[model samples]
Target: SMKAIVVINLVKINKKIIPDKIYVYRLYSIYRLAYENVGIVIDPENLIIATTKELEYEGEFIPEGEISFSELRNDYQSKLVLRLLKENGIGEYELSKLLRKFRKPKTFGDYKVIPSVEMSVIKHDEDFYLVIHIIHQIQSMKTLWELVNKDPKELEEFLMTHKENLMLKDIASPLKTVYKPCFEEYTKKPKLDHNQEIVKYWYNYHIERYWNTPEAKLEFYRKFGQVDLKQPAILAKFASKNYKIYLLPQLVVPTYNAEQLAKEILEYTKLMPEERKELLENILAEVDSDIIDKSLSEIEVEKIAQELENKIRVRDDKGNSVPISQLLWTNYSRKYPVILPYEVPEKFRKIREIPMFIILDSGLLADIQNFATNEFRELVKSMYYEKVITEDLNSDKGIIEVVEQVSSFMKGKELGLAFIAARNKLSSEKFEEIKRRLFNLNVISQVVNEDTLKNKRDKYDRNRLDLFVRHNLLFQVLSKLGVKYYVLDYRFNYDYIIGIDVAPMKRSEGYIGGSAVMFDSQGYIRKIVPIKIGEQRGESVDMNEFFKEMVDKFKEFNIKLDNKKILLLRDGRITNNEEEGLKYISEMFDIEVVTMDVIKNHPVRAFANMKMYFNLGGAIYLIPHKLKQAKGTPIPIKLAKKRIIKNGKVEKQSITRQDVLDIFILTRLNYGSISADMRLPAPVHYAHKFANAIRNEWKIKEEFLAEGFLYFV
Candidate 1:
């Protein structure tokens, strides 16, 4: 009765209302009013507008000057629809205080479920419609204050079970709320202050919150010693119970481990119509009936699916509509015979062996020497690459001493890469420091936790040890050695495809702007540029520098720019500065430019027998990969063309079918991982990695640019 393709948690609205008038204002111009608590729709067009009611300050807004429905973007139009829904008494759902007012609410179990609805607007065949997504929020009835008052083992078990849902509430600083995953590994044991009759929980502190006053600073110092605001915090409970930990209500999603989430979803889908109706009605009984329909009919759902199918289509390479079944396996395996890291092709035999430097504690070194030599030898023999361990240095000393030893050793003999096997899990600061130091010595390094190597059930059960060697260790080694696991068989029309992304630094207050440029025909990375940016940095700096480096590399490779097209894929929106830089590049090189924003997260999921791709107008969403366990309902990525420049002229053009297929193929080009199921395109993924490396490892010098090695990977 049903096809393979189906949309989950979506219902179509039957009625639509067109507003009488729409007013638009510059976001900055009306920032005050919007900040003062007036509801406003901030659109991508950088305009803040109102739909349900007129603004009080008429002079601040541009009076609906020659505005039409089409003029408002899809999201803007959706925001208007949201306003209309709010006016009709369907607003953001919050916990009702009536239960508390009347009497203490009855708590039957560990948590309580609350029903909620989320709505969005989308256009299909020139008709704007609303989709109400049904979701449930889970809130734990017990607070951390109550939980910690129990036995230590009980409190530990409770924290372990509800790791991700814990929230901290500071009574003294009422407005300051913090979210943390209170895992046992990430936190210290609870400490008691006998004099004050208070208990303190020590957890890693990463966010920016501090004691401003001198008295508060002294108090913090007296309790924890050395008031470095960024150091681990003492989450304390005073006599009056000043610190409270609440398990904040979280919206239910398919975010649990792969197998359980997938099984639950499949079981839910297999339910009979009557059973499904009963289940939904029982849940919705707690919610107000006036706001939503109790349940959607099967016929209504089928009609909505049919309407959507008529508007969106996914096609194969031959321009035929692709069936859901045919999309099971990636085109990667079909195009390239070599799928695994061990299956090295003959073409990569030029560099027969790569030397490796090992850094580990005495215990880990003894464990690896005693139990895992056979696995490493087997991996090396399978890949036909000789394994040569140059030096195995003990990291029992401090991080600084180990790094300095590595520096001194490098002066005597050169090696391919360094692998640091840490005895304990290194903090973020120490990891970054090691990476930065090795980077300065012109060495590419990989760090592995000691537990990864030492945790083994038996010698015969070598699955974890084998995976550590083959999947994690060797994959990176081969990538740094300029080995190609697989590449796309198809060629693109553009000469160069570049990916740009920006990442905020963890240790400091700045951003790292990075770009990766790839040759289109072979899907080989041509150049990678990583630059540091200040707080007030403009995108133009990174953009211009990226182009300049690309041009230099192009010159070295003897590539001409006449009649060529460059495609720029950004991880997010392209700012005005980036747009200007792109225009300058187009005019300077006399080449065409194409730009698109690839959005990874959106409110759309596809539940088919197999993975598939679908298009809604020019916006494309592709579920490029899935695991056997299927971690969650597969959410497809949304891609939309932002600009197209031809002969120095810029205009908006719809993204083509070829563009979608090209991106799907690009997902298979990740050489760093043996698995073909990469969630993102290779270039964009590399760009993100490069930006992150720059953010954490400080900076990348021009002298350390390896010709073929993906050092960042």
Candidate 2:
């Protein structure tokens, strides 16, 4: 399909003229709005006018360009009655006598201007046609156009009314945001050690279960802390079950108030360049860098502070709202911020004290055991404990080579690096960091991500995540470790549902193994079917016809197109070439088709108003950036709304708000072995399964293909 170019023009009587460049394969229609009984009729010459009882008018549609619909106006009739309705109608007396009124306007369709206003004088000879560029007002308040012709207050209001709202269309300042640091902000306090904190957090809730009495607490402490201490020695002053938290005074250090410092620097910006440099030098002079060295004056702290100010709200000691730069300066001009470590709470302070705290009475324990009973989940449990290895050794030579060489090289280099002890930097903490760096991130990802569910395809294997769910570990581990994993559910109304996806053959890449999973009215797996599309280049199948054939074949299973409404869900984009066929399937079969494409994972850019919003169980809307966008491009939903593309040629899409919700909805419907969310819908998964299994020697057995979705799932 070729990209077509078009535009819209203005005519008298507040009328619009659309470009006459309609596509050869475009949908077009003309309405005849005159008669006692209204009916859909043809308008070949494109000339029609009307006057409703309420003084409404409808006429003047020029569909030469792209497709669109006719516009509506107050009325075509004037003076005394309908006879006064002239092609060159003049409302000078009426408009002059009465009131006149009027807006961010926009343009769309082919070379079209929207939300814009234009005026012209009456004319003839153009089929006695009227051409007036109708200006449509959007905002009831002052418009982008009105700003230049308004008072100071109005100008200020216009500038502040919708900050950055104009960015969606025209150019505007780039979104002001800072990178949220990747690492967790560990508010490390000089509390009970890591293990103690863990023990207290994990076991303290059921204190009696983990500890029979106060005496048991000592035992737990000794066990987890790896100490040989008596109860009195451990508890006398060092620890208590619940004592008012106290902290040793941390030494105070003088530091500039960040906000005040920023203010001073801002004042520096008001000074000469050399004076600013001198100010920075003076700032560096007052800091003590014995324990640590940080020089904000080394960087453009003022500029960065200002940038932050633009996006943040802060207040000064005087209670006046101050810019972020000033706020930072205020912080800088204050005494040095003290790192007063607080004690870890008693509940969690004893966690690391017990190594194998038995879960004798947990509601979670039962579920975990039951889930782990599954053979696959049993393997997952083993892998969690670093017992059994599921990584396929025969997978790829390059991976093996990298893993072997890197592992061998890194293993011995660690102890040898202990030579750094001779230097001043090898403190226990710094040395530990060195040891940690010795085993890089990839090493953990490639070998053991037992701690956190990281590198999905690490040694744990492709189905490790499946095992995580099957073993009932994700919910437990994430909760225990303070990680968030939202479990969401949605309501689907369709009685019958079908999911479709095409899995292209690997080696050939030509033949496509398409699969469909049919759900019964009960919403349970009814049947799975495998479809093979092309075997030779361009040896294609009509997608709609193929779909029709699939639907028909399943009639024996009582899959009738009678009382029940069906949802034919596609797992990918409905391409331009395929949209027509898909649309045909929807209309012909009287089925509903909703297409979902995830070729690109949604980026952080797909948001509005905040870094995160749309709830776990909800979905964010994305509007098409333009009339046409790339197949799978995400439209940030905040901007999604009915937009005029072209007149008379525009039509309704079967896609709906509910369909958008269902996209997020169906992804959460987990029926697989792992109880994990299914990535692709079941139908597409079956197709992919069939495509993968059909390679080399494997094939989808006839019975397997005919079996319920569960068999393949």
Candidate 3:
């Protein structure tokens, strides 16, 4: 039913053309259409044409066998491009320069599609693809501008529809025509400095995006250029403000902890005089040299102080040099609020067996003063934590209601409970102890661990406690109130499953290399380990070497690989080297290697009215039966079949009859999200995330990734 790209030999056109320059110039024009959207490769003297939707509509007209332009698809957009070229086409001088720079087609592969033409290519008229994209976007903007300017009635309606959101006062300024400067202008002498060059490339890149409308450009100019107007450029006021949360009146029992105080002292260490090294030494001696408060050690303290001192030098009104860091970090000697949990005496936590029951606006404590037990204290503490056991005991509801609500909340979700306790600065041990005591009444078979606790306090802004509370509190309350999320009914059959991904240490410069998450027989993530490879520019790590080192290194964990099925989930496309790497591993371990690409991002979209929701693990092939798809595009996993060749020559390669289920299942394994839609599966997602972090660490920091696990969780 479908067709392949029908290649045509353009041998005749090469022989009879007036000159080589025109022939080459026309060749690029044909190639541009083919390269941008279709699979049309042009070699030295042949135009390998592909069957495309655009080309088919032209109805196979080859114009008396003289290589007709009519044979190819020529929409209005294409015509406009050809018109522009006709007026100011390439000459022999420019054609010679372009030919020297142009290389053979080697852009598209299975994993990545690096566009052959980019604005970053500084040479004038070299990137035909870039020129094509710019024309499309620019013309689109122009069309919209003319639509309103040409007619008054349409303009009024447009303004009226937008008036509520727009600054009405700013509408008076007329929208003017704008010119796109030549790429050569941006690349030449004074303009093409390092920073400016980068900026220009991005500027042109952004303008080339089909989605950027006239309004979008206006907003960009307003934000970056800050173009002064009678009012402001269009819609500046509509921009959302940062720090937007406005909480209503609620009880905020603001407390501090030892960690908070330690952090405060650490802040102004730079301003601390070197003369006070003795003071710091004394402080360090008072606390156990190893038993730390927060992450501060004596060596770390002095080093941080020294580092801070080098960066700070300020002069006051008195003209004396001072370390402004002291003033910047408020409250040097002031005590921070840190009423974390404390061990109280029996008197403080006692209960009375036969005490008089009091009833008032706020009554006395639970009469457990004379006869208290561990169970009673923990039960009461949980009640107190929830504020249900208020000052008045008589006014409170029944005991069964309190017990069910309070006890269930404590034992409901471990991760949520951990976060709740973390807010009050409770340790992992204390939280578990509390849970064990509380949930023991419910069931003796309950099991939990410290690793299951969700604590991502470092990722978000520390200063923005309100933001933290604003996002997390709702889910905490929902979990407490007995709400649960949707879970997918999916199963993977494998004894050993591993996810592999690579992340650049610093923004595509140096790569930190491949990291993997291995799952045991139970399908639980056993270990998250980093694969140490070469530190080069966006380096392709040797997958074979990584797995070899892994098997040797992991033997100490008592992990054996006897008669096991291994599943490898990679984030991107695996190269031929990795395929060979897989073969080597399969032979060594005597196991089958099942590799699946769990893509991080997909360009394809599914639309529905009023926003339809997907089942937790819902997935299907986006396009059925299509080969030569881009490397990273989301093709349904079930359909992406590959030939399983075993040491076969290219001429005598054997076809694999076996079909694989290439379903891109969107998983709902994210415990942190109680209401969000399908998330990527945990093993691959976390591997992808931590690999990125390692990539950043390689770029910015060291010391870390020196170990297998750092701040991955």
- Among these predicted structures, which one has the highest lDDT? 1
Residue runs of model 2 more than 4 Å from their true location after superposition: 1-491, 503-513, 533-541, 552-564, 576-661, 672-698, 709-713
Taking all chains together, the TM-score of candidate 1 against the true structure is: 0.62
Better of 1 and 3 by TM-score: 1
The C-alpha RMSD of each candidate to the native structure, in angstroms, is 11.6, 31.9, 28.1
Tens-digit lDDT track of model 2 for 1-713: 12221111211222222212211111112332332212122232444323222212353333223222223121222111222222223233222112122112222211121222222222222211222222222222222222324243333333332221221111011221111111111111112222345334333433355455778667644533322111100010111111222111010001111111112222311223233223323322332322112221110000111131132122322435432121354432212111111111232333332111111111123333222223223322332221111212223332343334444544433111101101221223322333233223112111111222222222433323332332233222212221112222233576666776554343333244456677644334455665545443454546755565566656644466433455555544445545555556556665555443332222112211111112111223332222121121122322111111111122444434455444433442333223232344444554454443343223333332343513222
Kindly report the root-mean-square deviation of model 2 from the true structure over all alpha carbons. 31.9
Q: Give a tens-digit lDDT track for model 3, residues 1-713.
A: 12222111000111121111111111235555544433243332554443222343233333122233334332322332333322233222232233223322121111111112111101111111111100001011122223344343443344333222221111111222121111121111111122334434444444456216788767655533421111101111212111111110010011111111222222322111221222223332343322122121110000011332222232322435432122346423212111111111122133322111111112222322111121122322332221222222122243233334445554433221211111123333333343333333331111111111223222333221222222233223222222221122234566666667754242334333467766553434445555654544334666677676556434534566534676666655556776777676667766566664444333221111111112111222222222221121112222122323222211112212121211222232332332232234556766776675453332222211222222233
Scanning candidate 1 in windows of ten residues, the lowest lDDT window is 249-258
* Tens digits of lDDT, candidate 1, 208-304: 1455567865664554343222212223222111243322111111112211111233332232323333433444454463444444322111111
lDDT of 3 at 619: 20
Better of 2 and 3 by TM-score: 3
Per-candidate TM-score against the hidden true structure: 0.62, 0.30, 0.33
* Ten-residue stretch with the least lDDT total in model 2: 246-255
| C-alpha lDDT (0 to 100) for residue 577 of candidate 3 | 73
